[model samples]
Target chain A: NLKQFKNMIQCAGTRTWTSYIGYGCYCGYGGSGTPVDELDRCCYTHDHCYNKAANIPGCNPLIKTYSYTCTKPNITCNDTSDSCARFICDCDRTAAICFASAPYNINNIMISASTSCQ
Target chain B: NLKQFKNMIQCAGTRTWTSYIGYGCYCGYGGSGTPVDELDRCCYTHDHCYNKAANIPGCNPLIKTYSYTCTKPNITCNDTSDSCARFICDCDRTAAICFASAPYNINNIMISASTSCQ
Candidate 1:
């Protein structure tokens, strides 16, 4: 049991960093865990980027993007409204591009745990 | 009256370019119009960047960023979920930086029409 417990310790390269947007393979808003593979690492990087971007002078003073919509009545896409809307949108856009540019791996993305270093 | 009508014609440098996310100073999701000033122009450029980013493979897929949230029940910020969430978020992040980096001009940002080129 002692050996098994020791073996369960997080591997050096497989651990996740806690981030504001998220951590590990999960890349949305908040949480933390280890990455499963390269695809999972991609998500971790994106989460890290968002956390970093959040610190930019005007990058996260929301008008939270979590619940904003352009379709709202009286709000047109061309409205000059200055909210953190663009900052959050860009973060998501970059992450999407990151996901597409990274090597494809459905299994790694779909699995919830890090098995590579285990 | 004829001279005024001629003056009303969209000025050479003040006309807006139509775009998918939006065309003018308004920078949320959709709309079109001429930019009022440099700050407004910043929003237009951000809109243009989003339009360009939308074409990236998997960047603007059906998992619309227009209406997504990580705060929902059962949805953790670290969820390894693959939706366009990150892509859109990045777009917003970039634009926020863009908004902050651009020159400060509340008068231009608040007005609806262009007078600089007029």
Candidate 2:
């Protein structure tokens, strides 16, 4: 079970670092009665990293390439003791990134949460 | 608005990547019915990273230290298109860590979500 967890951590690497771009345009002009100009805008997109090692077989190399889906779940931070959290690649294989939830309290040092990502 | 977004990105760094430990004990016995052994266990704790830079002023150094709460939110990954996402410190200072939501589609490359950490 520990080994499975470790593998899941490794798979999370590629899934987390991906990037996205979003664009939006204004159809009509503001108070100015001229032909509404296009605002032409772009924003960073967000998504959740998924686990999909089963689809690919024996393809692990120095830098393996795997893909997963992105889903934005409602995350709220309560305090350091009962905050929401997630794990991430620490850049170093030995470590992973961990984030917390809402109402977070920094003094406790130990984080707590009712649930986690599934 | 863009500047505020950029600052928020910077603030997110210290918020994420915190670690926690959890311990549980099994007092009673299982089906075996021996002196129910104490499972003596430890699991990684999860939390949500919070933004708290407003408290500290002019503390930006080569390696600034900030604290935030940790919350473990229920994040589901569906596909690449409508997955949830979060930002991280890229280590290079020029980039950040981005994770997606559920039902993620790796092909789309663009991430989307309803809201983000406030």
Candidate 3:
């Protein structure tokens, strides 16, 4: 259900954008680094959220490879009724809303940089 | 094997760090946006390089998912002697050199962000 309405949520960009940051910022075991921006921050939080969920009593956040495009639109984090699944959806939901409510042009930011990585 | 000595290079960081940027900056068909820094610029250039190599006469840059950890010690871009494989190793080698020559602290850069996604 979440995947179905994921795009319907009216965000600045699509989930693909989030996926980009997710790959950049990383999650779970090792973090890629700090986020690039506030948008990246959302992903950073999402990463930590998943990490946090992994240790939750009953949550089993499945490990996933970040994709740049939607290989399976029908596949979603909330596919099951497990608590971990629900948390996964929640993390995504928060990021989606954050993207939608962001105060800058997401496109502009994506194309520019300050070379934070030494 | 490129993978065998990829780490043997005297760089400021490891291939894992480059892998992080590769995931963030992206390559092939779509770009994640602009690179975060010069380190990321190396990745940005690498992405384009891979994309460029893909269209070369006999260069077949194989598609790959960026791995955060050393999933396979024996696996590497130069595993084969194909021109494309050489190009793949070249791209990585260039990035590794760039990392080694970089003037800033790679560690400091990985842990900060400016909310560029807004």
Candidate 4:
């Protein structure tokens, strides 16, 4: 029993919203997301990002991306405090586009949010 | 106006907490808002943009730009339009970025737009 307890497996990557308009602040906000392969709801048009591309270039809103920390390793919802502690990747595996999801409950508003997108 | 999302809250004046969360430096909570094609509740780097940077550059949160034209040329809601009609830029534009003030009764949570970050 002592060896079993000592070898107990633990630590996992749990996803959480890095930032959202409605939810409470958790973890500090990072840049517009990660450099490559972030998450976002793309528009596929200049209709968004506006002059942002003029200065940055190729950063079309569509195919744009950002990020959220893995929250941490080995997270059990039951052990976490914030309601939106659990995060899971919705990527279909072997894909170029993907977004992360996590629990979001605040101000009577409850829902999941996708991380910055590419 | 030909309905272009012009000179809106162009950037943001970062600070700490205001306009709720994503008000950029005005708040640490709202890091960003998605739906790139549309800009409603938040922006890219900072959230809220005003007439000028809330602070000079090199700040931790890093100041941004912000501007809003209440009434398109007017700024007073003593008894009409909105108790804050004095606050508006494109309340009436094209179908691009629609404006809505809801609850229409007490108007507690005035601004209404799910938001589509531009």
Predicted structure with the largest DockQ when compared to the true one: 3
Ranking by lDDT: 3, 1, 4, 2
Per-residue lDDT over B4-112 for candidate 4, one digit per residue giving the tens place of the 0 to 100 score: 1233211212221123222211122222334232233233322332111111121112211123334543322232333222222222121112222211122212121
Worst 10 residues of 4 chain A by lDDT: A87-96
Error of 2 at B14 (Å): 24
Flag the better candidate by lDDT, 1 or 4. Answer: 1
Task: Give the Cα error of residue B69 in candidate 2, in Å.
Answer: 20
TM-score for all predictions?
Answer: 0.27, 0.14, 0.35, 0.20
Q: Rate the local accuracy (lDDT) of all candidates.
A: 0.36, 0.18, 0.42, 0.22
| lDDT of each residue in A63-88, candidate 4, tens digit only | 22322222333222231222121111
lDDT score for candidate 1 against the true structure: 0.36
Of the two candidates 3 and 4, the one with more favorable TM-score, higher being better, is 3
Q: What tier of docking accuracy does candidate 4 attain?
A: incorrect
Q: For residues B23-106, what per-residue lDDT tens digits would candidate 3 score against the true structure?
A: 323211123445556655665676566545533333333343222223333223433445655666666656656655554444
In terms of lDDT, model 2 sits at 0.18
Predicted chain A of candidate 1: TM-score: 0.41
TM-score of 3: 0.35
What range of 10 consecutive residues in model 2 chain B has the weakest lDDT sum? B21-30
Model 4: how far residue B49 lies from native, Å: 5.3
Query: Residue A58 error for model 4, in Å?
Result: 36
- Model 3, which residues run further than 4 Å from truth? A1-76, A79-118, B1-31, B63-82, B103-114
